[PDB]
Amino acid sequence: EFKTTPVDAAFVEKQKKILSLFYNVNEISYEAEYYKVAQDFNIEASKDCYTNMKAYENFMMMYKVGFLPKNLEFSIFYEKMREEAIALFKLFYYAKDFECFYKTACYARVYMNQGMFLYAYYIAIIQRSDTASFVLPAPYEAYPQYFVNMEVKNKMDYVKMMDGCLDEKICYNYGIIKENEQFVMYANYSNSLTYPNNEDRIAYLTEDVGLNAYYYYFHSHLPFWWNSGKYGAFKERRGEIYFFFYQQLLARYYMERLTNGLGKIPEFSWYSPLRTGYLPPFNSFYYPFAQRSNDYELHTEKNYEEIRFLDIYEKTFFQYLQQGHFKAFDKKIDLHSSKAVNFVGNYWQTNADLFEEDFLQFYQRSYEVNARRVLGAAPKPFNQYTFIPSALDFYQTSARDPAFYQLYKRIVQYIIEFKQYQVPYTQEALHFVGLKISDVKVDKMVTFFDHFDFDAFNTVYFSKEELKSSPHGYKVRQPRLNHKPFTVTIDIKSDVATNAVVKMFLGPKYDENGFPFSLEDNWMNFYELDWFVQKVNPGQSQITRSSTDFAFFKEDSLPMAEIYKLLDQGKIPTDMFNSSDTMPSRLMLPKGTYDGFPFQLFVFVYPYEPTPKESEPFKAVVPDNKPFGYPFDRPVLPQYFKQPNMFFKKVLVYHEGELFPYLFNIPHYTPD
Amino acid sequence: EFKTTPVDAAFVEKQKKILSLFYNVNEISYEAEYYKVAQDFNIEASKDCYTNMKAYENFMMMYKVGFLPKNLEFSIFYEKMREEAIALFKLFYYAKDFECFYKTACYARVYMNQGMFLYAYYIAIIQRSDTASFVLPAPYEAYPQYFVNMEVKNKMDYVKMMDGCLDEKICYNYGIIKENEQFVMYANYSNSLTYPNNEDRIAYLTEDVGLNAYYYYFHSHLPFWWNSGKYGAFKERRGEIYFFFYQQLLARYYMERLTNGLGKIPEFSWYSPLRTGYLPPFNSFYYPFAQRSNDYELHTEKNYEEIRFLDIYEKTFFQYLQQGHFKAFDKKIDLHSSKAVNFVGNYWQTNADLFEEDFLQFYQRSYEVNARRVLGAAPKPFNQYTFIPSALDFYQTSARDPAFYQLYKRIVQYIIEFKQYQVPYTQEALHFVGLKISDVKVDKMVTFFDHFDFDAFNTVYFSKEELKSSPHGYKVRQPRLNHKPFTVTIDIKSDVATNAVVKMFLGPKYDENGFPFSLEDNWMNFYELDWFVQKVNPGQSQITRSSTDFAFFKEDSLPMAEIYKLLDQGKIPTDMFNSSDTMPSRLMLPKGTYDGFPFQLFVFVYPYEPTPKESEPFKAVVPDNKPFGYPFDRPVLPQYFKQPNMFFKKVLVYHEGELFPYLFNIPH
């Protein structure tokens, strides 16, 4: 009951090579294969490992100067850095074949900044079409310092310096135990000291490792600085998925807020104090992460120039809308087409497609980068290779900061302002003639917390001796949200014999007040649970769909220990290779309440139009003509949403066992 | 459904006369008794109707000048108005006997500002020892303009102008119905258009008519501007009563917050914007009530002077705290005693007692009065008699404004700072030698909403013809919170045999965190449910105690129409008589969840010391020399609250039927 895929022996060899660069990423083992291979890799004499001569020579130019030194923090949001990671990726991506890529990576694993190496390496593995099917470690196993609060990281460093536990009893009381000769450290989510306000209610979501990893995978599947020509016809839809990704994520987040009684995502101004502070429980080699207080004044001497830029970046968009048709980055933008939809997203992300070039150029300033800089609260960088980090400097920690959700809310509002220019769906575009949903039934929907382990060994240091055998076994254990399986049953009268699409969303039923949401105001608050095609036949029939089969959710990634165990059996975990960029399903449902929190499930059935065969960047691109998020991709006329083939069903989400995650990490106490 | 008291014939004659002044408060019936008696009343030639000659002549000087004109808004927070209300109260109170009192009242009811009359008349009935036992209409029946949202008031006004329903079925859809030839108007609590924020989650408590009446009652039972010497031995505890009242209230209010996901009462600063606005649906037929927007700057030009005042009034207090001991207002005060608690309360209320005088004087400025003027947001009064009203201008609307709880939270905190001077209770002062609570059991505690009617006839005008028949029958229907009765059973093992005091408190179990509250930071958050004396037996016994019997909660007021019918039978309602100044039962519990919301029940048993034989200003004054709120009148060391004669029980408060009151008011 963990999805398997069989896999042959040539595969095992290549997968083992790729996985091996992730062992002890923070130090160098002189007797690892990678070290020998890098010693033996003559880079000057290797023009013929590369499909692209320019990339090679471009790398050598920067190479001869020198790169970002080992041990410094890496972030693509600083330019000098970005130009280097991009050079590294071009090398990885234009390597003739696998041998070539492996020597290049070994070299980089040895001689280059570990952050930069891991960033380029992940992206290249996802992007190279000969590596497309290989599995990667979960990002929290590759960069545990981005996923572990200081408290836990310190406890582990402490256990290491002592070479183990003084005595068991002392240790157990501090949440430190041995299991099968490995160390396990119980971890709480952070308290009122890092989230000095109500946002702490939600720390179990915002600090969730799955949810942070998801954002990282999203970025690495199509990074802003890269064009999307690798993906064919998807190029003309890149901006669409940008909106969708953020609209869905914020919809997921607002639902968490509702169950924890927290109301709307706050709005703000660049010219005003921002309310919800955040003190990141992280440090880099030199600096504690930058802290932002409650009521932090965004508008100060240090951010004035940035704020001017941000301000006119948004107001330009207003000017576009005001005008309908306008000259923008080559063509005339007409707001009534869908070349408009694409433009809108590329505009807000300042991605490579906006400029219709291959890679983001050195002088093109991004809206999102400057926003993160203002909101990150950090002091200005010490030099081009040394910045003071904040949660917003990385996709791995971004979702920990309340400001992150506020910033994307603002962008999503802006896009929704443009979406006011889109013609709404008519009766005839949504009516499925000859078919009616007569009823929807759902099993009990139940959430709970349960423990979850990962190996954090990459954040622990090891002697020359211990390294000779790839040492690990430093596990973090944490209560994480989860739900039970449940089945949706859909009942249908049908005249016709066609293939059909069934979509299901979850959205709010009541606002923070107690009033029924009205669709005109709530369509942006629905997130997709599922999509699939079904043969329908006339009469009454019924489709059953288990939550374990929902399209947009995955199983927890396996740890590397387990990946290797499986490899020795010719086995690969499906969800880790066929769909890493997908939301973990443990977070499928907001945390419920013991009585049951009211949400609603929208079930929509429409005719299926045979759409060709692609191989797009994400799981969110289903083989359909339909816009992403359809029929909730755009403003609603409510009288058109009483279609026989639509059905809004009230459902309560329960919760069972302890309502608070800390109750799982108390020494002489066991929960429920 | 209500407790009755048999009542003799003399009483009924007097009670009827009293209640008759509360009929059609807003116009005059040329054919009613009160009118003829008022006309026959030579105020000039009847000095001998009064105990106090000074009071008599004082009123006359004033009356020769002139009083607040009829129809204008009356508020005791404005100097000249207060001085006039006090003069009229002096008259009522010093009336030789009930006859002179009636005449004066008839006289006042005819020639005077009706609001000013009602204010003075209420208080007089409560204070005069020959009226001590008589009953009063609930505040919402006497001043329904202060308990009705504008939409409802207008629905009634237009029905009157129409002389009834044109068409039953349009009317129905607007929540207007005929019942026994009386009109019933259904009323919603106000929407985000009234509280443009989170505080609207709670409108069902803050707008609640019981809760607002309760506050009006607490004021009238002992007004800040008056002396407390009428209650003798109680005078030494007036400040203690003042603290306890607000502490309890805020504790109750915070519990409603917690069940609606709301957290701590925000703190504020006179020199910064106040986050939470208030827009009242009330008007004085002249000005609408002043609105306070969100993020309203307190420190603007028109408030410079008042903020200066409020600022030193506070800082003077800090200086007290810093100095430990000092002379103030005659006295030498040492913050280690209880002559201290009393002083501290009196200080904060600037009441008459703080000056050792009979009535507040013209020029002794009140912190609460200016706090309320600044927070109330109104432009400055136009003249002596004409201000722009705010919710904080009246005891009967105060509880409706978020700022009200913020203001009293501030005062109560300053008192808690003082309380750190008080020496904590020790093991020996709390331990009951030879007695132990072995268990506490509680019935299911269930809240719910159900309908409640009152007569709003007082804000409707009638013709000469109609008036001849003193007319009513304009009823408002509203969902109100409520709970099902429940029993607490306490199990006690004891060695010997004495009378015991049993006390029950309700506190939160967790903060907005989800984290257990510790007693150190929670003692202020317990509200008292009950107090009673018990004969304890040797060995094992069980005390059973029902909610319907809880000492600090009352049944609902009956409307006058019902009071009249009871009087016709020789009966009155006990609670309106014996305990009007007590909180209503239905509000005993905060709204629960279907779920069941986690709180704790604190059960205390201590030895009974037969003491005081008194004459009570409030029912909060129980015949015990212990402090009010004992053992939660002061900072706690959590390790002394483990005596066998204490039990903390987790209870869960459930809720049944509809969670939102508006679903109770939907048409077809």
Ligand SMILES: *[C@@H]1O[C@H](CO)[C@@H](O[C@@H]2O[C@H](CO)[C@@H](O[C@@H]3O[C@H](CO[C@H]4O[C@H](CO)[C@@H](O)[C@H](O)[C@@H]4O)[C@@H](O)[C@H](O[C@@H]4O[C@H](CO)[C@@H](O)[C@H](O)[C@@H]4O)[C@@H]3O)[C@H](O)[C@H]2NC(C)=O)[C@H](O)[C@H]1NC(C)=O
């Ligand atoms: C206290 O507060 C509550 C809540 O605000 C309020 O209840 C609301 O009352 C209104 C009418 O008084 C009610 O709407 C009526 O609604 C019904 C129900 O409609 C339902 O079905 C529709 C499809 O058939 C669907 O589209 C709706 O969303 C809903 O589920 C409806 O039959 C009425 O239709 C209209 O009639 C009016 C006549 O004036 C015409 O103008 C119009 O052309 C329609 O024919 C009408 O809309 C509403 O649903 C209630 N709100 C909620 C949130 O439940 C109470 O009235 C208020 N009570 C008092 C005494 O103040």
